[PDB]
Amino acid sequence: KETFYITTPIYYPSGNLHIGHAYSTVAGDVIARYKRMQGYDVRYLTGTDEHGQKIQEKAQKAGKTEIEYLDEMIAGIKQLWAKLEISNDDFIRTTEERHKHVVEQVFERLLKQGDIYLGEYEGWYSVPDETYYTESQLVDPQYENGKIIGGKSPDSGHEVELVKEESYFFNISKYTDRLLEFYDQNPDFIQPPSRKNEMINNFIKPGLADLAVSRTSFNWGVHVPSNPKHVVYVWIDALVNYISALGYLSDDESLFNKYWPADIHLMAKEIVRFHSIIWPILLMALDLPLPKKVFAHGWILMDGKMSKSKGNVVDPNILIDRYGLDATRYYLMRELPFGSDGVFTPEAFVERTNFDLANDLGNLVNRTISMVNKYFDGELPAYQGPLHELDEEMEAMALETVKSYTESMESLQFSVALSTVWKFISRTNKYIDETTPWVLAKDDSQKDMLGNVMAHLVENIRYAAVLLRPFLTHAPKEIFEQLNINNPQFMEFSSLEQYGVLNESIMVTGQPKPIFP
Numbered sequence: 001k002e003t004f005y006i007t008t009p010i011y012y013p014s015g016n017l018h019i020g021h022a023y024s025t026v027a028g029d030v031i032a033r034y035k036r037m038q039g040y041d042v043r044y045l046t047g048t049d050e051h052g053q054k055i056q057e058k059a060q061k062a063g064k065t066e067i068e069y070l071d072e073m074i075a076g077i078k079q080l081w082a083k084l085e086i087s088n089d090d091f092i093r094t095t096e097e098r099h100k101h102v103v104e105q106v107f108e109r110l111l112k113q114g115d116i117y118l119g120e121y122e123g124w125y126s127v128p129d130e131t132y133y134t135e136s137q138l139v140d141p142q143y144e145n146g147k148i149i150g151g152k153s154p155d156s157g158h159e160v161e162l163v164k165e166e167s168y169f170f171n172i173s174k175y176t177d178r179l180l181e182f183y184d185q186n187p188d189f190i191q192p193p194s195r196k197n198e199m200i201n202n203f204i205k206p207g208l209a210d211l212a213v214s215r216t217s218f219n220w221g222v223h224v225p226s227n228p229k230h231v232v233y234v235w236i237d238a239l240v241n242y243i244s245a246l247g248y249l250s251d252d253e254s255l256f257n258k259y260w261p262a263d264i265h266l267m268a269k270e271i272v273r274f275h276s277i278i279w280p281i282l283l284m285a286l287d288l289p290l291p292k293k294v295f296a297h298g299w300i301l302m303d304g305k306m307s308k309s310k311g312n313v314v315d316p317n318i319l320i321d322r323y324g325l326d327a328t329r330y331y332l333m334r335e336l337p338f339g340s341d342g343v344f345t346p347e348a349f350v351e352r353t354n355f356d357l358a359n360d361l362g363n364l365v366n367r368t369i370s371m372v373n374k375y376f377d378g379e380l381p382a383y384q385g386p387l388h389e390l391d392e393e394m395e396a397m398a399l400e401t402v403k404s405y406t407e408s409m410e411s412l413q414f415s416v417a418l419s420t421v422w423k424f425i426s427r428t429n430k431y432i433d434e435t436t437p438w439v440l441a442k443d444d445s446q447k448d449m450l451g452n453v454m455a456h457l458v459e460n461i462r463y464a465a466v467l468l469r470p471f472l473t474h475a476p477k478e479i480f481e482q483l484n485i486n487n488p489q490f491m492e493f494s495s496l497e498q499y500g501v502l503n504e505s506i507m508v509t510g511q512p513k514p515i516f517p
């Protein structure tokens, strides 16, 4: 059993998670389920990032300890994943010891080695944006004696002021040629291609500046063992969740020894830099193998991209409660091409939900069961061969739909994988219009052919349902329940290699009802 390790990022609970966080986690579950159906030993991880100055500020505002603020927020997040039916194998929290021990030890090791050195951090903080800007990338600069003394933010235009404190730095520039050599040896490391260019051209080529990895202005966080005044900053703390959750540096490294390196790291494009540059360099200094792929998908837009800070938010609980689980998951995996951006509209949601699920697929199944109940009393005839003339091309189309499904899935374009599946569904509906089974019913002479048409409809659906198990968690099962396919074998990918596995007659449901919501 070949291992496949997949991770989502660890999300910051400064506020409630929205459809964008859902979108990443949902995509990871799709890969996880897909990969399990191909017979991999899968580990899929998600988690939270629980340290920093902001978690004090939100917890002390609500009137509670930092941890009992987090406990509430994590309980709400675990609930959202359970409701989305995320098949994550673990939840990692940076506030738990298996993580904290690893951050402590990695920091000291890089201190021992001389990768890290004590210095002073200098930057420009904007209160509105909650972002730190460098001297150079500042806009509308003010000079006093020829040095920038004050300025504006690039992204808002609010006044900033300098921040200066003691900080440990990670000298990463010496790993630059090792890192570029890594990109050349592993040409699919950064996905998609667009993001790899902007990594080389905008960060590495200018010169990778030393990285401020610790702070003194707050206390909530992992403290540096050799210097308690310093508390570890976001990069080293958060990034090592991918390995700490596997029991790295613990009593039991068995999960680390078998699952690391990561087959794929999911994220949105704002943090590709830390996964494709800093994370591989950190692992080099730890002398550990690098991840095999980092994937940055696009943004859900609204005004701007969806953020919890700015409130332009859609709660996935509202969408699931209203329109259903399978609709919500479908919308996220269908409307935005993996890697491109896209704008959310509740009108686009409802059209996807209705036109594809309810009207194309839901109606296909209902007509097919209805007709089988009508003409053969519920007793579906067995498969034999491509007796109708449309069947040669259509039986072949089934197989080619799986070939095209696979490569869209391997290459991570699930929107295209889903649209290819739906092309087959739409054609299955057309086959009813083309064959006209109601005309075949009148002649008792036409009985094999009328049976063949139903056998082809049912098999066409089988294929679609089978291929949709990674995406939709109720819909496939409900279709199998109503068709009354029973052995698990015909729900797996293997059973799609040769067309027409049902050569035994089966009694479909006498009471078909809507598949969705």
Ligand SMILES: Nc1ncnc2c1ncn2[C@@H]1O[C@H](COP(=O)(O)OP(=O)(O)OP(=O)(O)O)[C@@H](O)[C@H]1O
Pocket (backbone or CB within 6 Å): 009, 011, 012, 014, 019, 020, 021, 023, 024, 266, 267, 268, 269, 270, 271, 298, 299, 300, 301, 305, 306, 307, 308, 309, 310
């Ligand atoms: N609009 C979005 N589209 C896609 N993924 C998103 C989006 N917002 C959040 N994510 C997911 O969460 C990760 C980081 O979350 P992030 O802190 O940026 O969310 P946020 O709501 O923008 O937070 P903040 O309020 O601090 O800006 C992304 O890498 C991605 O996995």
Ligand SMILES: Nc1ccc2ccccc2n1
Pocket (backbone or CB within 6 Å): 012, 049, 050, 051, 052, 053, 221, 222, 232, 233, 234, 235, 237, 238
């Ligand atoms: N460990 C740590 C410190 C500060 C943070 C700020 C923002 C996100 C995560 C953080 N983690």
